[PDB]
Amino acid sequence: SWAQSRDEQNLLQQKRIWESPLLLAAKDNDVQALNKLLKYEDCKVHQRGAMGETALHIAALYDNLEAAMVLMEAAPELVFEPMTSELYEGQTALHIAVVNQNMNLVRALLARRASVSARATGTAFRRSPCNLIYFGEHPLSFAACVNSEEIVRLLIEHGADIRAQDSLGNTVLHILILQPNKTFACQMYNLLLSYDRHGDHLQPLDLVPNHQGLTPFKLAGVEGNTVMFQHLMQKRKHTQWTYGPLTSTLYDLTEIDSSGDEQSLLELIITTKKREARQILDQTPVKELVSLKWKRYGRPYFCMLGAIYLLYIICFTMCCIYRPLKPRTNNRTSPRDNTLLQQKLLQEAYMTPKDDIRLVGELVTVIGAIIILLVEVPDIFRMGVTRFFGQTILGGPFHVLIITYAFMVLVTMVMRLISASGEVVPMSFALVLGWCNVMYFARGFQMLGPFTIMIQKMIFGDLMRFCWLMAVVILGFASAFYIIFQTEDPEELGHFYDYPMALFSTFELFLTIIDGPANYNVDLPFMYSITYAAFAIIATLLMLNLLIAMMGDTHWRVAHERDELWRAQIVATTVMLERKLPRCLWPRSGICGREYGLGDRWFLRVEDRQDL
């Protein structure tokens, strides 16, 4: 958060140029002074600017062709001297004129034995939202981003190497994927692949990995580059037989499927959270693969885990409602009419000839709680500890919720074995978080799927937009009613005797789920009737109806994210089950190879009407 140090360096650049006389003469076409300043005075050859540059840079930066040519004749050594500051490090004079994208200077600058393999690092060239650009490092890539393809044929002639990575790791092909000018950068991608004379007996320049470990085809998948993803597909598929308006292709599918030992394409589209990245699930190779792996091979394995889970909690609620109880002995009721306990649960009463079935009842549900923690907790020691806060948009808060369920059921084993007294406090949390976690199996069924991803967008966002302003009005008005019934016997209107209940009975009246305090035999204090009518004119006629105004306004301008988030949620179920189920189940989708003269990669086909 110190961009002011970057803002200081730019404004220091002018004042240094205003100081020296020939840098002003390099800023403009003051070529009359360039004949004088080098012939008459001395030693003004190697002084630097504010960010450590030469007069050759400044004439290159403000595209002054006439002044740059005289300075090269004066001392043909300034091309070898790069910039030296920490923002612009190593950036030579060739790099400046190529970004200006229309120069005949590069034919005159490379004529004086200029270098093409200069290392242009620095902090204004690495990928970050602080910069507005990402040009890579090499001048081959500098021409590749501004789309001056006349320069590229002239720069590749003098020894420019294609396969050149950088300090971040990506190649020249990867820079073309990451541009906002998507439309006619695709026409340049045909050129950079075409200047590949030999494959160097290794990977043929389209499969090179970076340090972050991606191919250029996969990198189109993560950043959501839709239009470039189509032209990359054109090398993979090949048509088989055309028959009038009916045609039939055969997609390659060696890289868009999870068959492997490491990352795939369907793994990374779910893992990223870019809004544009989840539109590749609508194009023709990916949609056919995910729907063939879900109408079969995925859905009866999803409802087999459906019915096993529903027969877990029903064998748990039946274990819950039969708690071992007795009458309340040896603790006879000391306060009068203010305690109403009469059970005081058992501790050593699993020796009874009915209770042997309930011993099975805990033994079933506590074996499953071991299996829950041994199927999710080993996914945050192999994976990072922030991925539970990382997949939270798509399929995330249920993985928080199932961990907390099994941690509560293990508490009630600890307390009952040690014979504790307070017992229903975790066991009531272990029965809401059970039955509200069968909510997770609503993403499978359509007509129940855009109604779970809607309420996830609503319990965050809009209701947290309201629960503050709900807990600001009621937190005050409860303190207004608790003053006003200090002068009142709680035998009538017992809604306010303790401030811990007055804060409750205001919240329970704010939603109109109590009637409202009225006795009608005795009178009321006079200030009550005014400040309660000011509550109703806020609570039931302004503040609560403004939910339905916001529920009805949100629910149609996320009605297109709704039906798309369900499609991305069906894939996070698809990739997760294939990774955890073994290999006898889930045969790999598609027809295999090494039988029909194709190779070892396994294919898929799709056919469609051309529509003429």
Ligand X SMILES: O=c1ccc(CN2CCN([C@H]3CC[C@@](O)(c4cccc(C(F)(F)F)c4)CC3)CC2)c[nH]1
Site for a copy of itself in 340-359 (CB under 8 A): 340-343
Between residue 501 and residue 560, which ones bind ligand X under the rule CB under 6 A? 530-531, 534, 538, 548, 552-553, 556
Q: Residue 361, interface with ligand X (CB under 6 A)?
A: no
The pairing of strands 241-243 and 246-251 is: antiparallel
Among 111, 130, 227, 246, interactor with a copy of itself by CB under 8 A: 246
Among 194, 533, 580, 582, interactor with a copy of itself by CB under 8 A: 533
Neighbours of 97 (CB within 10 A): 25
Q: Which residue has the tokens 């009458």?
A: 327
C-beta of 362: minimal distance to a copy of itself in Å? Answer: 15
C-beta of 429: minimal distance to a copy of itself in Å? Answer: 8
Q: Residue 471, interface with ligand X (CB under 6 A)?
A: no
Q: Residue 473, interface with a copy of itself (CB under 8 A)?
A: yes
The pairing of strands 604-609 and 246-251 is: antiparallel
Q: Residue 260, interface with a copy of itself (CB under 8 A)?
A: no
Q: In this structure, is the dihedral angle defined by the CA atoms of residues 357, 358, 361 and 363, taken in order, positive or negative?
A: negative
- Strand (E) or helix (H) holding 165: none
Q: Residue 603, interface with a copy of itself (CB under 8 A)?
A: yes
Burial class (CB in 10 A: 0-12, 13-18, 19+), 368: middle
Among a copy of itself, ligand X, none, what does residue 597 contact (CB within 5–8 Å per kind)?
a copy of itself
The closest of 183, 259, 173 to 209, measured between CA atoms, is 173
- CB nearer to a copy of itself: pick between 325 and 375: 325
> Is 337 one of the annotated binding-site residues?
no
Mask for 403-432, x = binds ligand X (CB under 6 A): -----------------------------x
Nearest-angstrom CA–CA distance, 593 and 402: 41
Which residue type is seen at 9?
Q
Among 456, 505, 573, 589, interactor with ligand X by CB under 6 A: 456
Residue 157 makes CB contacts below 8 A (sequence gap 6+) with none
C-beta of 485: minimal distance to ligand X in Å? Answer: 16
Q: Which residue has the tokens 């789920």?
A: 513
Q: Which residue has the tokens 């990402």?
A: 134
Q: Are 119 and 127 in contact (CB under 8 A)?
A: no
Q: Residue 527, interface with a copy of itself (CB under 8 A)?
A: yes
C-beta of 311: minimal distance to ligand X in Å? Answer: 20
- CB nearer to ligand X: pick between 370 and 455: 455
Q: Are 138 and 172 in contact (CB under 8 A)?
A: yes
Burial class (CB in 10 A: 0-12, 13-18, 19+), 228: buried
Between residue 284 and residue 313, which ones bind a copy of itself under the rule CB under 8 A? 296
Among ligand X, a copy of itself, none, what does residue 397 contact (CB within 5–8 Å per kind)?
ligand X
DSSP per-residue codes, 256-270: SS--SSS--HHHHHH
The closest of 75, 32, 40 to 56, measured between CA atoms, is 75
Among 514, 585, 594, 599, interactor with a copy of itself by CB under 8 A: 514
Among ligand X, a copy of itself, none, what does residue 465 contact (CB within 5–8 Å per kind)?
a copy of itself
- CB nearer to ligand X: pick between 151 and 394: 394
Between residue 293 and residue 312, which ones bind ligand X under the rule CB under 6 A? none
- The piece of 385-393, 412-420, 448-456, 577-585 that touches ligand X (CB under 6 A) is 448-456
Question: Which of left, alpha, beta for 351 (phi over 0: left; psi -120 to 50: alpha)?
Answer: beta
Q: Which residues of 502-513 are buried (b: 16+ CB within 10 A; e: fewer)?
A: bbebbbebbeee
Q: Residue 468, interface with ligand X (CB under 6 A)?
A: no
Task: Specify the 3-state DSSP secondary structure of 582.
Answer: coil
Between residue 181 and residue 210, which ones bind a copy of itself under the rule CB under 8 A? 181
- CB nearer to ligand X: pick between 291 and 554: 554
Among a copy of itself, ligand X, none, what does residue 456 contact (CB within 5–8 Å per kind)?
ligand X
- CB nearer to ligand X: pick between 432 and 467: 432
Q: Residue 468, interface with a copy of itself (CB under 8 A)?
A: yes
Q: Residue 121, interface with a copy of itself (CB under 8 A)?
A: no
Q: Which residues of 165-176 are buried (b: 16+ CB within 10 A; e: fewer)?
A: bbeeebbbbbbb
Q: Write out the binding residues for Ca(2+).
A: 515
Annotated binding-site residues read: 515
Which residues of the chain form contacts with ligand X (CB under 6 A)? 397, 401, 432, 436, 439, 452, 455-456, 459, 530-531, 534, 538, 548, 552-553, 556
